Amino acid sequence: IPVGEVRLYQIADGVWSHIATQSFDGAVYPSNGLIVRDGDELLLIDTAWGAKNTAALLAEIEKQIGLPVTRAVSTHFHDDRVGGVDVLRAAGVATYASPSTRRLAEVEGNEIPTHSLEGLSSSGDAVRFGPVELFYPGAAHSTDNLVVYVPSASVLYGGCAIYELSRTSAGNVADADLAEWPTSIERIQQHYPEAQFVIPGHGLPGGLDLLKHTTNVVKAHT
Ligand SMILES: O=C(O)c1cccc2c1C(=O)N(c1cccc(C(F)(F)F)c1)C2
Ligand SMILES: [Zn+2]
Ligand SMILES: [Zn+2]
């Protein structure tokens, strides 16, 4: 994969996913996020994995959509979710994450979203944020990982708690809770059974089978 590629594609009316490539532990990996139309504005879910990529994303949005990103949510503290928050903040975007994500990002020395998202501290908590629903399923890929649902389009953004179908073994589990991860996926399945399009943090999107597949991989690990 070539490094530093940033692009986006439309899933539904007013719903896009952005895709970036970045070097991680020496190799090039893809990384997904979400863009959701919020009236005359856009809500951004997750950075494009780095300052340079995220500045490129903001220009790509002007080329393809032409509406201003006014708010951004990071779904956990890893650099592929918050790397670029400083670029967003300087561009005039209000950046958000849960208190736990903000705390864990600070510990790592990663960039720190400005605003705390209240109402997501207990597994099963769900809150509306502009045109999306934010959901804390419980610990999985990280203790703080959030998932995002678009009620108007039945799009489920699982973030890095959800794996793509081609993955057959667990990935990075340094920050994960393997004992809780299957239960947390079960909460997602129970709360969003009508999802028609499911996006992993890395790799190809698909249907709801990505949830059960992720459980399978996690349990077989282990
Ligand atoms: O889930 C994975 O194993 C995975 C797959 C593709 C790309 C990435 C991952 C993953 O866990 N990443 C990542 C990025 C920043 C920091 C970390 C950490 F902190 F877990 F090492 C992991 C990047
Ligand atoms: Zn991560
Ligand atoms: Zn990730």
Residue numbers in the entry: 39 to 260
Could you pull the original sentences from the published paper?
The crystal structures reveal that 16 and 17 both bind adjacent to the zinc ions of VIM-2, but in a mode which does not involve direct zinc chelation, consistent with the NMR results. As revealed by analysis of the Cambridge Structural Database, zinc–ligand coordination bond lengths are generally less than 2.5 Å,30 thus 16 and 17 both do not directly chelate the VIM-2 active site zinc ions. Notably, for 16 and 17, which displayed the most potent VIM-2 inhibition (IC50 values of 10.6 μM and 32.8 μM, respectively), we observed binding to both the di-Zn(ii) VIM-2 and apo-VIM-2 protein by 1H CPMG NMR analyses.
VIM-2 is a clinically important representative of the class B1 MBLs (which also includes the imipenemase (IMP)-1, and New Delhi MBL (NDM)-1), that have a broad-spectrum substrate profile that includes penicillins, cephamycins, cephalosporins, oxacephamycins, and carbapenems. The B1 subfamily MBLs are di-Zn(ii) utilizing enzymes, with both the Zn1 and Zn2 ions having crucial roles in catalysis, with respect to β-lactam substrate binding, and hydrolytic water activation. As revealed by crystallographic, NMR, and biochemical studies, the new inhibitors bind via a mode that does not involve direct zinc chelation, but which may mimic interactions made by intact β-lactam substrates as they initially bind to VIM-2.
